[PDB]
Amino acid sequence: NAVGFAPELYCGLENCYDVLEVNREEFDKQKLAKAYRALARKHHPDRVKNKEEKLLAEERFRVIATAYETLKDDEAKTNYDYYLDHPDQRFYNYYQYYRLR
Ligand SMILES: [Cl-]
């Protein structure tokens, strides 16, 4: 439930698993990498000609890359899953996010 999310953490008001169209319950790193590479290709700014559309592509690309960075790193993913599961533990979740970075 994205009402429990903080805009400044992780994928903001999207769930990073949803961003990459991967399933938390059927997760593995092979599937995650394939999903990232396909969506990164799709949203890459080289694929569009004009300056304004390239900015819009970069905007989305940033989210795709954040989702992959969060889920591919074992420690970040453990922190992320805890955050999803414990939205009321605000200080702890913020601390773990910023500590890792
Ligand atoms: Cl957001």
For residue 62, report the distance from its CA to the centre of ligand 1, in Å: 12
For residue 50, report the distance from its CA to the centre of ligand 1, in Å: 25
The method recorded for this entry reads X-ray
| Cβ atoms 42, 2 nearer than 8 A | no
Within the chain, what is the greatest distance between any pair of CA atoms? 44
For residue 9, report the distance from its CA to the centre of ligand 1, in Å: 9
| Cβ atoms 10, 93 nearer than 8 A | no
For residue 10, report the distance from its CA to the centre of ligand 1, in Å: 9
Q: Which of 18, 22, 25, 5 is nearest to 84 (CA)?
A: 5
Q: Which of 82, 44, 61 is nearest to 69 (CA)?
A: 61
Q: Which CATH number fits domain 1-101: 3.40.50.720, 1.10.287.110, 3.40.50.300, 3.40.50.10490?
A: 1.10.287.110
Token code pair at residue 52: 């304004």
Token code pair at residue 35: 């999903």
Domain boundaries, the chain: 1-101
Q: Is 16 helix (H, G, I), strand (E, B) or coil?
A: helix
CA–chain centroid gap for 4, Å, is: 16
- 12-16: list long-range contacts, CB under 8 Å, 24+ apart: 12/63, 14/63, 14/67, 15/84, 16/66, 16/67, 16/70, 16/71, 16/80
Question: How many separate helices (H) and strands (E) can be counted in the chain?
Answer: 5, 0
